[PDB]
Design a binder for these strands. Sequence first.
DNA 1: TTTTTTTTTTTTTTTTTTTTTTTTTTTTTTTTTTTTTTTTTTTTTTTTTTT
Length: 88
Amino acid sequence: GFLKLIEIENFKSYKGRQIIGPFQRFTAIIGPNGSGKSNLMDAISFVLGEKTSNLRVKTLRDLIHGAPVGKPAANRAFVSMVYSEEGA
DNA sequence: TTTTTTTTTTTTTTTTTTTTTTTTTTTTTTTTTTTTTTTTTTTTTTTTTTT
Ligand SMILES: Nc1ncnc2c1ncn2[C@@H]1O[C@H](COP(=O)(O)OP(=O)(O)NP(=O)(O)O)[C@@H](O)[C@H]1O
């Protein structure tokens, strides 16, 4: 199979629920500086698992959107992909 | 004009100092080990809350 698309919620400067579009065979993630694009990869490394120290943030509580600034939004987060393999 | 006297420059000798080079010794930062402590994370029971 391959990596179809993912799903974000409140994790690291992505407020609300929005669906990352379907991925073609070979895509790219462009954007100007400081826009916050590395954090999608951070999300990918968090669904598939990576020790927290490698996630360039201490304590795992400033993960929620807006916490490193000083004001959280909720007490949840939800990141999720949808793997699509042969067999329908 | 020639002879006699003075002074400056050039060059060699020497002596003291400086530099160099190696060698041997020493003592120091560097590198590795072990420990071990902290802190973050985890769990599980307790507590709180909801139907
Ligand atoms: N949970 C959060 N909520 C809101 N903002 C955040 C959060 N975490 C980090 N940020 C900020 O949002 C930005 C995201 O940083 P980061 O994801 O590293 O961006 P980037 O993708 O590396 N930028 P760039 O390479 O220049 O395109 C930075 O300014 C962070 O300080």
